[PDB]
Design an enzyme around this catalytic site. Structure first.
Site, PDB file in Angstrom:
ATOM      1  N   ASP A   1      -2.887   1.518  -3.075  1.00 45.53           N
ATOM      2  CA  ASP A   1      -1.429   1.289  -3.280  1.00 45.53           C
ATOM      3  C   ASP A   1      -1.141   1.026  -4.766  1.00 45.53           C
ATOM      4  O   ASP A   1      -0.120   1.540  -5.266  1.00 45.53           O
ATOM      5  CB  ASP A   1      -0.911   0.159  -2.388  1.00 45.53           C
TER       6      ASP A   1
ATOM      7  N   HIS B   1       3.995  -2.622  -0.516  1.00 44.61           N
ATOM      8  CA  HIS B   1       2.837  -2.459   0.404  1.00 44.61           C
ATOM      9  C   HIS B   1       1.646  -3.256  -0.153  1.00 44.61           C
ATOM     10  O   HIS B   1       1.074  -4.066   0.597  1.00 44.61           O
ATOM     11  CB  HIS B   1       2.479  -0.979   0.623  1.00 44.61           C
TER      12      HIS B   1
ATOM     13  N   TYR C   1      -0.333  -7.310   1.369  1.00 43.29           N
ATOM     14  CA  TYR C   1      -1.737  -7.757   1.568  1.00 43.29           C
ATOM     15  C   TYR C   1      -1.911  -9.133   0.920  1.00 43.29           C
ATOM     16  O   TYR C   1      -2.529 -10.007   1.551  1.00 43.29           O
ATOM     17  CB  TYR C   1      -2.720  -6.709   1.046  1.00 43.29           C
TER      18      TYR C   1
ATOM     19  N   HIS D   1       6.810   9.378   2.940  1.00 42.27           N
ATOM     20  CA  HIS D   1       6.202   9.726   1.625  1.00 42.27           C
ATOM     21  C   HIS D   1       5.360  11.000   1.768  1.00 42.27           C
ATOM     22  O   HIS D   1       5.514  11.916   0.928  1.00 42.27           O
ATOM     23  CB  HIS D   1       5.372   8.560   1.068  1.00 42.27           C
TER      24      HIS D   1
HETATM   25 CL   LIG Z   1       1.330   5.827  -0.408  1.00 41.23          CL
HETATM   26 CL   LIG Z   2       3.793   8.141  -2.122  1.00 49.75          CL
HETATM   27 CU   LIG Z   3       3.530   6.285  -0.370  1.00 50.43          CU
END
Ligand SMILES: [Cl-]
Ligand SMILES: [Cl-]
Ligand SMILES: [Cu+]
Ligand SMILES: [Cl-]
Ligand SMILES: [Cl-]
Ligand SMILES: [Cu+]
Lengths: 308, 313
Positions: free
Chosen positions: A89, A123, A127, A217
């Site tokens: 990420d 994202h 975590y 995405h």
């Molecule tokens: Cl991603």
């Molecule tokens: Cl992405």
């Molecule tokens: Cu993404």
């Protein structure tokens, strides 16, 4: 006769990002959200912005009881796996998404990839919120050390980043789709396996909020890939398809090594890899190609698929 | 013997992905650590801008139709043109400026905060589209885009900043990044506040205040990171950068004054808008850690207009 008294502004101007990196022959046009070239862009924009969320929204504290039931080995596996996903990420937020902006087909796409960069950052942050609530400082530090020294894990982002920094926009786009489409699913197997057995239900809510973004995405990058590649000669299209299958083959090779090392001790490796390969198939489909993967090597337990 | 290191911590023998990508492939990559934060300022800014998330769909712009319909074609044209011009600046910052900052970040969290800035400045540009969608005709909207493309005084301003974003000098890039939210749009922001001070287009001014709630933090943050970076230069190169900041701001003021005269002279707003602009040039310099060289008289803002600026939410 058709009298054209003036020439349309759009066709004699460039977007700022084109002007910055590619073409200074003409003046810059402001983004036009009132005259949209591709309705798909407005659709995606509305969905991802309406789907805005922060990990603070989820009561992770309620996973404390089920977390405390997991052996030290399992808690370590989860912290390691999630820190590994945090790295992917970080790569995608800071390099991958922002690299796509200058290669946009449309104005709105430039703004959608800015949204992607921010949300993939969220994202990664999520975590951090899970660890903050559940993990000891020692577990957190151990996982960071483990990620830095894990060559099998490092090889995966190391293989994609060159496509982002290089000047081939189609190879960059394939890499950009490959991250949400394939590379994290081996990791996402673990929380879905656990939640199917009734462990860490609130963590799996965060995972599903991440997936809600990542599936869009993958779709979006694949859609833009297909638009661009369709304009090339049959020979160029055949070369690009070959590159896609060659890159995916290498990435599947690297992912299988990493997942065996991650899961072999717990007996989850074969299951995780089938889960991985199932998503590799959907990745190929979202790029407009056919899955060559068998029913047997992509089989997922119903209860895990249900969590998906 | 007493001081030998037998365990080197992960952080200092690894790099963030963006460092690996553009600077150094010799070391392995570390995932972002949100659990051990290097600069507490980053978490405060992250929490504020994410909590301040908004979409222009949230504001009932259609409630401006009555006051909009009282303005003649000249005024409606001026507003559409002005806002399309601000849309250009936001497009520049979202697509080039903010993302250029990510790789020159001092901290991991800063890389994510500039990703947020890129997105939210995209939301700023989009919000003008929402205003136009509700109030303007197709002809007015297209007229304004043509005017922006062909307006050399307008274009000169973003053309002066973009080179610093695409060039190698990360300090000059950061100054440009602070200058955009700190200075360059305030000349345009005067118009809506002038009107809403007189009860015209109040819902539009709520959108401007939501944009400014972001822009003020963007200016503060880029300024804060600028100060941390220049403090690591020799006193000679500190004095050299300070002179550059004053030379760049002097140039940008010259270009802005020209644009605002061309934009506003016909409506008798040019003088007031430039004073409003120079007031914010002052705040820009203060956020870079320098003193404003501008007089009270040079920066005078009518109280009812200042009430619109400083108003909350
Ligand atoms: Cl991603
Ligand atoms: Cl992405
Ligand atoms: Cu993404
Ligand atoms: Cl800005
Ligand atoms: Cl900004
Ligand atoms: Cu900004």
């Amino acid at each position: 006769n058709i009298l054209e008294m003036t020439k349309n502004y759009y066709d004699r101007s460039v977007s700022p990002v084109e002007y910055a990196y590619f073409d200074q022959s003409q003046n810059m046009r402001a983004i036009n959200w009132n005259k949209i070239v591709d309705e798909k862009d407005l659709e995606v924009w509305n969905r991802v912005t309406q789907n805005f969320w922060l990990p603070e929204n989820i009561p992770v504290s309620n996973d404390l009881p089920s977390w405390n039931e997991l052996d030290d080995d399992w808690q370590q596996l989860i912290t390691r796996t999630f820190t590994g996903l945090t790295l992917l990420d970080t790569v995608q937020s800071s390099i991958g998404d922002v690299a796509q902006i200058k290669n946009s087909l449309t104005e709105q796409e430039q703004v959608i990839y800015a949204n992607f960069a921010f949300m993939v950052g969220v994202h990664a942050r999520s975590y951090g919120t899970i660890f903050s609530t559940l993990c000891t400082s020692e577990q957190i530090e151990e996982a960071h050390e483990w990620v830095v020294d894990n060559e099998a894990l490092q090889a995966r982002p190391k293989a994609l980043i060159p496509f982002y920094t290089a000047d081939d926009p189609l190879k960059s786009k394939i890499a950009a789709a490959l991250m949400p489409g394939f590379l994290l699913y081996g990791g996402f197997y673990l929380p879905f396996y656990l939640s199917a057995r009734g462990k860490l239900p609130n963590t799996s809510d965060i995972i599903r909020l991440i997936l809600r973004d990542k599936v869009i995405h993958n779709f979006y990058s694949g859609y833009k890939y297909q638009l661009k590649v369709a304009k090339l000669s049959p020979e160029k299209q055949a070369e690009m398809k070959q590159f896609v299958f060659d890159l995916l083959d290498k990435m599947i090779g690297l992912e299988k090594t990493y997942l065996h090392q991650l899961y072999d001790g717990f007996g989850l490796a074969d299951e995780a890899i089938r889960f991985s390969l199932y998503n590799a198939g959907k990745f190929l489909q979202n790029l407009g190609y056919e899955s060559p993967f068998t029913k047997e090597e992509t089989r997922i337990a119903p209860e895990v698929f249900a969590q998906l």
